[PDB]
Amino acid sequence: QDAEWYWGDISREEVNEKLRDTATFLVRDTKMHTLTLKLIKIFHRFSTFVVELINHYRNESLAQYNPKLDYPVSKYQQDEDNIEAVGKKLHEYNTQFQEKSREYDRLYEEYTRTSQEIQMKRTAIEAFNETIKIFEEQCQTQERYSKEYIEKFEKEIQRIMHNYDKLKSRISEIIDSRRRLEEDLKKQAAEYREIDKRMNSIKPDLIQLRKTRDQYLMWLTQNEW
Template identity: 30%
Template structure:
């Protein structure tokens, strides 16, 4: 317990009652420290209240700590943390205050001269700015991490839905195969192999996603732990600032002058990130640029299926975001585009193949390959071909690996 307590600014260890009294003289109500008591295992909380120092015994009995029976705290720091937020009036009605201002054991001396107090306030304020900057940066990282984790969960849900659709189609195909005439069995077997190949691809992707979720969840918890660890440090600095401010105000210093410390410009501004500290922002920018440069549409397997009926296409696309699409092969001269429009509906459009390439018919331009057509309408709306198809080809339906960067 002793080694653990030494980490806390309010613990002064084996100092005398007189030394504790001196440390708290001329301080504000709510100022406190903890020291060893004469009884082994017990401690004394010295609290400033009503311009007087109050001595409160912290008892240690049967592995528990407390100010009075029943003793319920596992550690002294737990008791101090509790009364930092809750009034001591529940222990003694005359002590209606909380533990607000710890006397920092890192101070070699407690400043009493106003000029020294100003200097200490400046130092503490700059440290507070630095910690707040670190906390804000950490919170930003944690927010991005949480958003990516949420995206992983959403993508996994979509993959599982696709797996279910393909499993149902496999069962249906098995039933159809058993009832098919002899000349239709070969076609059923071919379709079965295609469905099985696609199903296994989805299953593999699901497994990868679930592993990624585990890793991201662990990393996110680590970030939350770091954030929570910083909050008590910042609160302690807040308390120090308020303590010094209170002393200066009681000594009749102008509030404007005290508040001016928060606008000091001749000290280093800790809130500004250096080039080295800005690595995280640079990494995010590189990822964004890479996402733009490496267009997933160039992999035709992410959006093309040679043998899929309309009902399966609707099942795959239903519930997906606007611009999710796939293309289904129907014959050597014809295929069909299915996409999710701005209303969330799945709409379809026929694509014809001619000697000039692929087009939607009606005199519109032809594209040498389906990929050329897809890339063009990745940037342009399809509404001129179909009034209901008011969208672009943004998200390949089979691109289940289109995940946020690890």
């Protein structure tokens, strides 16, 4: 009657947690008061059958009972006679997720730091551009009122022209600043991609190890590691 995909008194929550990452059939069962696919209560006394019922809908559509009811997925994973050894092997398998997680989550932070850093630079430029534009307006502003008083070529004009020049040589300095930022933001954007790159590479390795490990752990009969 065990039926290999029968979990006895496994909790409500854990079914969802063993049905975690499933594309499937699994069984649970207040005793005074149940197949999960969509939770359906069963009744031995739901809608001419218990064990045979599972085989009855194993290869048959449940459309008969309800319209919405048009993979056993309880393998014990025999795929190693030493409890400690298989345990050591699964713990050594585990010894990787505990490592794999760390690399995954290390990047997740850098992912975020880099991403925040990026917007900071991103907005910084805007800052420059509008600064930049004002200094332009200023140098343009003087020519209207600069040449307009130019009547002499006595002394004054010569001095003012030198003072006015700083402006064109300051604007030079600033453009160089934004520029210098822009080349870092590129260096950042490219950095950023690589993190996502390596996250999607650990991302699913991290999944398979966690599964067989849980499978090896589930496999034995009595959290050391």
